Amino acid sequence: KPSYVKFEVPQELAEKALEAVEIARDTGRIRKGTNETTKAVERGQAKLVIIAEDVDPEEIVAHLPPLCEEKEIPYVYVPSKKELGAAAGLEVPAASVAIIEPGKARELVEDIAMKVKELMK
Amino acid sequence: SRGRFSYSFQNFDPERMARASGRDLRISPKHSVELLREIRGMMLNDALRYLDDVIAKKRPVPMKRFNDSQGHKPGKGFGPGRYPVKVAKAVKKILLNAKNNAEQKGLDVDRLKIIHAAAHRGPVLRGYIPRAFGRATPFNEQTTHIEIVVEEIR
Amino acid sequence: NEKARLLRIRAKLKRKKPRFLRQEWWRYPKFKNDPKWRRPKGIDSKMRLKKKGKPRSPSIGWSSPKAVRGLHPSGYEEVLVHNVKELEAIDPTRQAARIAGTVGARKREMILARAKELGVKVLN
Amino acid sequence: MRIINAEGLILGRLASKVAKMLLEGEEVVIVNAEKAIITGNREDIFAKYKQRTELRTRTNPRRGPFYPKRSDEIVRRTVRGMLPWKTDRGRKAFKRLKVYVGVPKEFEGKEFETISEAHMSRLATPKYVTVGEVAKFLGGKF
Amino acid sequence: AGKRRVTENIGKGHGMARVERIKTSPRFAAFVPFAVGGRRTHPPKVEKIIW
RNA sequence: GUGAUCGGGUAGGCGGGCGUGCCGAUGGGGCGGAAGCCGGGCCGUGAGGUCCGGUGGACCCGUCGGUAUUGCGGAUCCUGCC
RNA sequence: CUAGUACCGUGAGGGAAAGCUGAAAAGCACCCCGGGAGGGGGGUGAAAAGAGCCUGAAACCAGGCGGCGAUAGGAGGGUGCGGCCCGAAAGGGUUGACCCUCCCCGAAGGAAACACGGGCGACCGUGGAGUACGAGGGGAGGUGACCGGGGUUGCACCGUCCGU
């Protein structure tokens, strides 16, 4: 139970978001990296965002959650940096991601959105 | 069966291919090498015709690697050539074995193509010839292995 | 910082450093299949005379800065580990762990679990 | 391509300039090769070139040397002498050059350069001969 | 040990090294330290002092 | 801390290190796969060390102290293979 | 180990080589081809380890893949700059590869344009100016995925093997 987190995810929409990211990378255009998603949600380019649960130190993405909260972007959690970066399409880990021009997974993506709305409020 | 030896061929598919070998043959490996080069890539029917023409001495085989003191032959591309009859006979037997094996597998014998043909040096059988001034020198037989894989063309 | 600077120095120096091999290692298979350095000792040897156009010989100048000599490129000091009792007495701040190659899978798993608890970096 | 009229130019100085151009990377065409000049006494000059022409390998004349008798080829050979002929760089440079006797139809009414540091008013003494004279003495068709 | 064979050298002017060899076929080298089956150059000796 | 007043080297003298087999002790590994072999990485001026993958199927390594048939390119070297 | 044996010499006498299947023979039943030795399908076994039997190195040979390959000159290499190809992750890297721009400090060293003048001249002196630069030592923002390595090979410069 890390500190800068505020939510909990069941495995079901966890893996749902897994596929969402995998096929978003495949089909549309998406953006992987802490600075990257900072900038996404700053410029207001962010449709859906993901953060990792294996982030040492806790200084690296602590602000992403509040700044997304402020600009009203959906942001969820995923357990392993390894799987995160893998589904992002890399031989390397990865800590936070964002999606753009999301085709083929509107269903999935804004379903995660509504489930996280329910988990939030 | 009795796979005492193996093949240098990689990626063998049993649904499409068939194999045959000849082992410990008392023929020249140099002539084997030169002649298998020429049938690499042919259809079995064409290769059998070629081998019969060689055996009858109606078509020469080019000698590109092992060609010392060798005469040239009539026509275009010659250059040195020979007529290796013994080797051609043994290879004919190997090819017929391969055809049998493919047909008991279930492939079409008119759409088979040779996709692997290679000769290897086998073990030497040692001998001696008497010479002058009290010497005996070696008089040896060099042996050959030959292997063939055929594939069916879609 | 000073250590980062000296690691940079070491990296550059050991990129420029040649591989030190005996006189004619390229000519005979007896030298290609066991490549090593041996001192040339012959009266007429050009590599002994250190003549231009000829490969170089090892010297005490090619050595790395003392503070960073023997360190992993990460920057840590390696310690071979054959069991979990050897894990403690590692300082996770400057030491890291390398598990020995003869350790079986049963213990590999245990050592990795305890290292995860203690927060010790395992390089393999 | 730079086109140079060799009329009244000193052969060696011309050749030095041309070799440098070919090495720097330019295509060159020399015209009026027969009208270039060589300074000094006729007997010494002619003796040099005849001695050049009678040099051959004693065991086989198909292996050279092959020093020239014609004027365009004399000029070409001098330039070749000023290059690194034993390297690929020199061979490519030498391929970038062409030499012609007189002016062929293809170059008529065109811009002809001139090399100022080669010119015979520069000279004082009148002892000089012509490359065409040399070719005629050696037996060249021009 | 190594000192049992009877040997002969054929000497010089034969294209070969001057090496003691046995007299009957197969005429292999014998007795000397660098021959296979020969005496060992400096072997362990029971007269050495341990105490 | 000092070195403008140290930094080539044949014969040759002196100092410190790497590697190999067995013993007394000590710490350890191995059918969840030892030695050996093939291919690749990292450290080390270097002699060399260690890790990854593959092949293999039963033993092996580190440190302290002792001991030795203890390190090969060459002898018109020896044995065997090509 | 069927060794003072085989074998050599008229004879006294001389004198080799040669160890290891598997826990168990469970040592390949049955079918097609071949004159046959054998090949191919099938079987035993944890594993072919198949008696031409533990492991199975190097030299050498054949085929496949990659790079070069018929205007070309040095003992087969060294340094530097490029082209074609390959990738493990034990090396690194989205917790930021490479690259682009701007701010600060900066050793020894050190410009040019330009204003005047000296010299027959090639040039020089003065001020510009110890400025602009400058190995390197720090910072800030744009970018978003390679790098290090390896095989072979092109261009330029250098290079007459080893032991005595």
UniProtKB/Swiss-Prot annotation, chain A:
The keyword rRNA-binding applies. This is Large ribosomal subunit protein eL8. Multifunctional RNA-binding protein that recognizes the K-turn motif in ribosomal RNA, the RNA component of RNase P, box H/ACA, box C/D and box C'/D' sRNAs. InterPro entries: eL8/uL1-like (IPR050257), Ribosomal_eL30-like_sf (IPR029064), Ribosomal_eL8-like_CS (IPR004037), Ribosomal_eL8/eL30/eS12/Gad45 (IPR004038), Ribosomal_eL8/Nhp2 (IPR018492), Ribosomal_eL8_arc (IPR022481). PROSITE patterns: RIBOSOMAL_L7AE. GO terms for biological process: ribosome biogenesis; translation; tRNA 5'-leader removal. GO terms for molecular function: ribonuclease P activity; rRNA binding; structural constituent of ribosome. The keyword rRNA-binding applies. Keywords: Cytoplasm, Ribonucleoprotein, Ribosomal protein, RNA-binding, rRNA-binding, tRNA processing. SUPFAM superfamilies: L30e-like. Signal peptide: none annotated. One of its GO terms (cellular component) is cytoplasm. Belongs to the eukaryotic ribosomal protein eL8 family. The lineage of its organism: Archaea, Methanobacteriati, Methanobacteriota, Thermococci, Thermococcales. It is found in: Cytoplasm. Part of the 50S ribosomal subunit. Probably part of the RNase P complex. The gene is rpl7ae.
Curated annotation (Swiss-Prot), chain B:
Pfam families: Ribosomal_L22 (PF00237). It comes from the Archaea. GO terms for molecular function: rRNA binding; structural constituent of ribosome. Gene3D superfamilies: Ribosomal protein L22/L17 (3.90.470.10). One of its GO terms (biological process) is cytoplasmic translation. Keywords: Ribonucleoprotein, Ribosomal protein, RNA-binding, rRNA-binding. GO terms for cellular component: cytosolic large ribosomal subunit. InterPro entries: Ribosomal_uL22, Ribosomal_uL22_CS, Ribosomal_uL22_euk/arc, Ribosomal_uL22_sf. The keyword rRNA-binding applies. This protein binds specifically to 23S rRNA. It makes multiple contacts with different domains of the 23S rRNA in the assembled 50S subunit and ribosome. Part of the 50S ribosomal subunit. Belongs to the universal ribosomal protein uL22 family. PANTHER family: 60S RIBOSOMAL PROTEIN L17. This is Large ribosomal subunit protein uL22. It comes from Thermococcus kodakarensis (strain ATCC BAA-918 / JCM 12380 / KOD1).
Curated annotation (Swiss-Prot), chain D:
SUPFAM superfamilies: Ribosomal protein L13. PROSITE patterns: RIBOSOMAL_L13. Keywords: Ribonucleoprotein, Ribosomal protein. GO terms for biological process: negative regulation of translation; translation. Disulfide bonds: none annotated. The keyword DNA-binding does not apply. It holds the Pfam family Ribosomal_L13. One of its GO terms (cellular component) is cytosolic large ribosomal subunit. InterPro entries: Ribosomal_uL13 (IPR005822), Ribosomal_uL13_bac-type (IPR005823), Ribosomal_uL13_CS (IPR023563), Ribosomal_uL13_euk/arc (IPR005755), Ribosomal_uL13_sf (IPR036899). GO terms for molecular function: mRNA binding; structural constituent of ribosome. This protein is one of the early assembly proteins of the 50S ribosomal subunit, although it is not seen to bind rRNA by itself. It is important during the early stages of 50S assembly. Part of the 50S ribosomal subunit. Belongs to the universal ribosomal protein uL13 family. NCBIfam families: L13_A_E (TIGR01077), PRK06394.1 (NF005004). This is Large ribosomal subunit protein uL13. The gene is rpl13.
Curated annotation (Swiss-Prot), chain E:
Transmembrane segments: none annotated. Part of the 50S ribosomal subunit. Belongs to the universal ribosomal protein uL4 family. One of the primary rRNA binding proteins, this protein initially binds near the 5'-end of the 23S rRNA. It is important during the early stages of 50S assembly. It makes multiple contacts with different domains of the 23S rRNA in the assembled 50S subunit and ribosome. This is Large ribosomal subunit protein uL4. It comes from Thermococcus kodakarensis (strain ATCC BAA-918 / JCM 12380 / KOD1) (Pyrococcus kodakaraensis (strain KOD1)). The chain holds residues 52 to 102 of 255 of the full protein.
